[PDB]
From a paper:
In the presence of NADH, acetoin is reduced to 2,3-BDO by the enzyme butanediol dehydrogenase (Bdh). SmBdh exhibits the typical single domain short-chain dehydrogenase/reductase (SDR) architecture. A monomer displays a dinucleotide-binding Rossmann fold that includes seven-stranded parallel β-sheet (β3–β2–β1–β4–β5–β6–β7) flanked by three α-helices (α2, α1, and α8) on one side and three α-helices (α3, α4, and α5) on another. There is an additional small lobe on top of a core structure, formed by two short helices, α6 and α7, creating a deep cleft in which the cofactor is bound, and where the active site is located.
The Z. mobilis expressed WT SmBdh crystallized in the space group P43212 with two protein molecules per asymmetric unit that could be superimposed with r.m.s.d. of 0.271 Å over 1379 atoms. Two molecules found in the asymmetric unit form a tetramer (dimer of dimers) with a symmetry-related dimer with extensive interface surfaces. The main difference between the two molecules in the asymmetric unit is that molecule A is found in ‘closed’ conformation (that could be best described by ~ 10 Å distance between Cα-atoms of residues Ala93 and Trp192) and molecule B is found in ‘open’ conformation (the same distance is ~ 14 Å). The transition from the ‘open’ conformation into the ‘closed’ seems to be coincidental with NAD + binding and includes the shift of the loop 183–203, containing two helices, α6 and α7. WT SmBdh contains acetoin in the substrate-binding pocket of the ‘closed’ molecule A. Crystallization conditions included NAD + and acetoin, and more acetoin was used for cryoprotection. We interpreted this as both (3R)- and (3S)-acetoin molecules bound in the pocket since commercially available acetoin is a racemic mixture and no other small molecules (like ethylene glycol) were added during crystallization or as a cryoprotectant. Whereas the positions of all acetoin atoms, with the exception of O3, superimpose quite well; the O3 atoms of (3S)- and (3R)-acetoin molecules are involved in hydrogen bonds with different surrounding residues. In contrast, O3 atom of the (3R)-acetoin has three possible partners for H-bond formation: water molecule W71 (2.7 Å), Nε of the Gln247symm (3.1 Å), and Ser140Oγ (3.1 Å). We found that the substrate-binding pocket is formed by two protein molecules, not a single peptide as found in all other reported Bdh enzymes. The side chain of Q247symm is involved in the substrate positioning forming a hydrogen bond with the O3 atom of the acetoin.
Numbering used by the authors:
A (entry chain B), B (entry chain A), C (entry chain A), D (entry chain B): 1 to 251
Write the structure that this text describes.
Amino acid sequence: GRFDNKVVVITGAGNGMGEAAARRFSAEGAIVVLADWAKEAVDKVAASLPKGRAMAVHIDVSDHVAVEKMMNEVAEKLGRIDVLLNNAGVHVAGSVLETSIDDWRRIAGVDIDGVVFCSKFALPHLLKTKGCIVNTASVSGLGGDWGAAYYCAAKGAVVNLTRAMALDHGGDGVRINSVCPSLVKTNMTNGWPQEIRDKFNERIALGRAAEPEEVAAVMAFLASDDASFINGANIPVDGGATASDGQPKIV
Amino acid sequence: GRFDNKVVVITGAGNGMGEAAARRFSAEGAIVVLADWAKEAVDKVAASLPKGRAMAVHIDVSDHVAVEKMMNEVAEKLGRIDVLLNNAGVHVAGSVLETSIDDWRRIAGVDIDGVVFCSKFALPHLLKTKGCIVNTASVSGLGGDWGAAYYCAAKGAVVNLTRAMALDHGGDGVRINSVCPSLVKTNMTNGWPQEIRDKFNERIALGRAAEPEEVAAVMAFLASDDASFINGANIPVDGGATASDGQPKIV
Amino acid sequence: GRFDNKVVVITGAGNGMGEAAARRFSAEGAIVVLADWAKEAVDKVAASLPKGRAMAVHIDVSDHVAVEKMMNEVAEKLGRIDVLLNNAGVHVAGSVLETSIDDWRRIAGVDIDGVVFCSKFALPHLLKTKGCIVNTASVSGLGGDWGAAYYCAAKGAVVNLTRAMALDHGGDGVRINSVCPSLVKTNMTNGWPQEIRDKFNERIALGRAAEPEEVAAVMAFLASDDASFINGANIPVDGGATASDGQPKIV
Amino acid sequence: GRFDNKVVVITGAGNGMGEAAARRFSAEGAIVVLADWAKEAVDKVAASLPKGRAMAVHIDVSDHVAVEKMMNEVAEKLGRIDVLLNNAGVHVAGSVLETSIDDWRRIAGVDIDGVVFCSKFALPHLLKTKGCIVNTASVSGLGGDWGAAYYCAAKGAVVNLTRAMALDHGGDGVRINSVCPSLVKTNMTNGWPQEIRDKFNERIALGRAAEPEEVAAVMAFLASDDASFINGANIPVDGGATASDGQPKIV
Ligand SMILES: NC(=O)c1ccc[n+]([C@@H]2O[C@H](COP(=O)([O-])OP(=O)(O)OC[C@H]3O[C@@H](n4cnc5c(N)ncnc54)[C@H](O)[C@@H]3O)[C@@H](O)[C@H]2O)c1
Ligand SMILES: NC(=O)c1ccc[n+]([C@@H]2O[C@H](COP(=O)([O-])OP(=O)(O)OC[C@H]3O[C@@H](n4cnc5c(N)ncnc54)[C@H](O)[C@@H]3O)[C@@H](O)[C@H]2O)c1
Ligand SMILES: NC(=O)c1ccc[n+]([C@@H]2O[C@H](COP(=O)([O-])OP(=O)(O)OC[C@H]3O[C@@H](n4cnc5c(N)ncnc54)[C@H](O)[C@@H]3O)[C@@H](O)[C@H]2O)c1
Ligand SMILES: NC(=O)c1ccc[n+]([C@@H]2O[C@H](COP(=O)([O-])OP(=O)(O)OC[C@H]3O[C@@H](n4cnc5c(N)ncnc54)[C@H](O)[C@@H]3O)[C@@H](O)[C@H]2O)c1
Ligand SMILES: Nc1ncnc2c1ncn2[C@@H]1O[C@H](COP(=O)(O)OP(=O)(O)O)[C@@H](O)[C@H]1O
Ligand SMILES: Nc1ncnc2c1ncn2[C@@H]1O[C@H](COP(=O)(O)OP(=O)(O)O)[C@@H](O)[C@H]1O
């Protein structure tokens, strides 16, 4: 019962890590708000969890007015917010020469503005509960990739905003951390050519992709009392990916 | 002259480190495009430099339409672009709880969008000259501050965009690097109280604020042949600030 | 019990975070080997734990002959090794100009050699259990201090040895990670003056020193199944210390 | 004449980067001490440089008594030391399971003790000239490699000792920085199988190995007045290697 009666708001709750986060927190006694643009996935997850202990909601995290209303209505209806998981995301592939101003606006709106807005509007509620924030960043926020320029800029914004907010609020009893996953098994990635999955298994020392549960576990730890002295941290959940200096594996 | 007949585009060239960069590159033979939204300031710097070797451009770098036009106009008139200094920036002080959505739009528009747009629209021209980009990020992009949340997110994006674009374009002969200053003596920090400045002399092991010329020296180095194997680097120009683990002096 | 019948070897187990780790793992069902060169201290901790579930080993971990023997003796008697906590450490204060070659030999022998030897001689046993290593490094290994030069070099080695061994062994089912505390309330720092401790409450955003139990909590997490995809990570347990760019508070 | 009449002591002066460093500094007016275990290479380089402006000397940098005598004799004979280049090195290949205690002693003696000892004994001389230190670290000190455990520990010690010493001495006017090269063209590496050199050209965005001159250039910059505000920095000279989060290049 690590999260007994704690109110956990999950943005991007309809993706693999979002759903694994929702089930892990629920299993540990949390009341879970599954917030997402899309309705089907979060409605199905919410319906699968204990009645009265899960609600699905529509949100555009790129919309600060909608975000502010969502955060106040959750606090009004459930009386508290204890945990924010900023798990919404969009990915676009390409260099800045292969990706449009529009692509940049899309990445920035969800991957940066979403973290800024949901953290700003949850914080007054988190300050009352001495709750915490866990951002879903990425190894792509700790270092660059080939062919994901906008994505790397945005997750780099999330990684450093995590540090800055942690300094601003940690002394008022609200810890702010991120998880920085590498390759996570979804149907997107299960479908990838074998040649591509092999290149990931070579660069990742554990030699496999993460299960979404393996990332949700770290999110749950970082929201737990055991993480009482972890603040402003960007935890690589990457089987060793970012532990390399970038030099090739030779035997 | 290290920069003899090289076209150097410098955003935020009307003041501080941009101005110091304009004088240093001009002294070393560069033709300098001075871009700024402070029309009088940038006109004065432009006019102070050798006739026919400097042109002022009145531009808000947050405007992708204006930026695209400037980069193509410069290329047409001067026949080339060798160096982009993404130096234009604005600061705002406070946590996300003390700074408005409008403060965020101002920070993100100049400090992220301006870097993204100027990089994107210069790059086709830099690919022809095998030129380079030097972003002015900040130590505020390599880690967090207390009370500059939006600025830290923005410079966070600049730091990781520097890495990603370096991976994308280095193989095509275009190096992308940043300088990451700590306290520099400019209009951006001239209002900051004495007790904060005194704490900077403690946290910076060199025991003083930087002169703008000291950062312009590193921008010139990073645009030089001597930096031919430096790519995707965020060079701290901070007198040791980021070298510290954040702990106070042990003795 | 998360660690039911797991053999956990803990260096520096007679005091501070090693002791707290011994109690936490023991509480969670571990059989604990308590290694220390403080024979009375480690005997007292060992004797305080459940009978037949703890053994004290009087060892100087800087001694590769003694370390090789302990690791093989433990494996013989207990039939397995599941977890190594490389926690033993000594501190010395000063620049290289104020600390002797003998100070360096003491720092390097315990703080680097001891980690290297214990890791090397445990690893054949951890490969059989698909166990893990948790190094106790320091924020003093992720960046510099004023006046702990030798200690910073040593913890520097621990941090990057953690990354390299993670790449070497993660694919064989052995995860290698560190915890990087800042100020923790132990014998190592109990002599440090009040003015320095007060500065720590400023530089640590949580505004307090860590309890040893708060670091032992993260060691237990990193040795747990919930850390199944964390490998080669240097987890800061520093209340935000390393999240800062080193600058003093901006407001 | 950037280094006119400045006394530059280069350890490891007989290797590719050592010789390129010696020629670059000499070209800029330096008086160069070429210090190395081996005699032939440094004698030949010294004999090739202006008479009265270069001397070759034997040193074991693993020997603190010999190092201390060398530093005092250079200061006695030439009257000053302005620059230390800590460029001595030994590499060993393998995990900790493939490399002996002896291998560790060899790596630690030259790659750590050499930097500690030469910096300790030069410093009193550098404090009189407000000179500087440039450590030859490695990307292998900024992150791990597969199959170089001891090497990664040692260069990780050099990277963090650089930070610590920079904090200790930068306020007394002695800046301390490192260069962190990746693959550098030598005959060792020119001879490598094409399959291995291809894997380096893939991970390095510039798509090639560094010339030793490209690393020497960065050493010369970091010792120059242009680097007046760079202190405690570990400059990647790696064509982008460490700019990657470790994820594979996919197209
Ligand atoms: N001063 C410091 O201590 C410090 C520290 C770290 C980094 N920086 C960065 O250094 C860069 C230069 O700032 P500075 O300290 O020289 O300040 P400054 O005020 O002296 O100069 C900044 C210049 O940028 C221009 N500018 C701002 N927004 C613009 C826009 N939208 N379009 C065009 N021009 C614009 C301003 O008019 C001004 O001339 C910024 O990116 C800043 O964030 C400053
Ligand atoms: N949207 C825009 O077009 C826009 C927005 C911001 C500012 N600007 C331009 O910036 C310029 C200044 O406007 P502002 O409101 O930012 O300015 P301001 O009056 O706030 O002054 C800007 C900075 O200059 C410093 N300063 C004052 N006197 C100075 C002097 N003699 N020399 C150098 N620095 C001096 C101030 O202390 C301050 O740090 C104008 O040209 C304005 O058009 C453009
Ligand atoms: N206390 C802090 O603020 C702090 C901060 C960061 C990291 N650390 C690290 O935490 C670890 C634990 O230290 P602590 O703070 O719990 O101190 P402590 O003094 O409470 O415990 C350290 C223990 O290690 C033992 N030890 C030392 N050298 C040994 C050797 N050669 N062989 C065997 N045992 C040996 C000591 O006898 C002692 O029991 C160390 O590696 C230390 O560097 C301490
Ligand atoms: N070469 C070796 O074998 C070696 C070297 C160092 C110490 N040790 C062992 O460490 C132990 C202590 O020796 P030392 O000289 O390091 O000790 P010490 O007298 O310096 O005390 C060690 C630490 O314990 C603290 N302390 C004092 N009273 C305490 C108490 N009642 N409970 C808990 N902590 C207390 C002290 O303030 C100090 O921080 C001995 O068992 C000694 O054999 C081993
Ligand atoms: N504007 C938005 N507001 C709220 N949630 C959003 C928004 N944009 C994307 N999301 C959600 O973020 C989650 C993560 O997106 P993504 O990383 O693309 O997941 P997946 O790869 O599994 O499709 C999704 O559930 C998606 O619907
Ligand atoms: N104990 C030592 N004292 C002084 N110089 C040393 C010592 N050990 C190695 N060196 C020198 O360090 C330099 C760099 O070594 P290394 O990296 O192996 O160079 P290379 O790969 O070109 O042979 C060499 O010139 C070598 O002789």
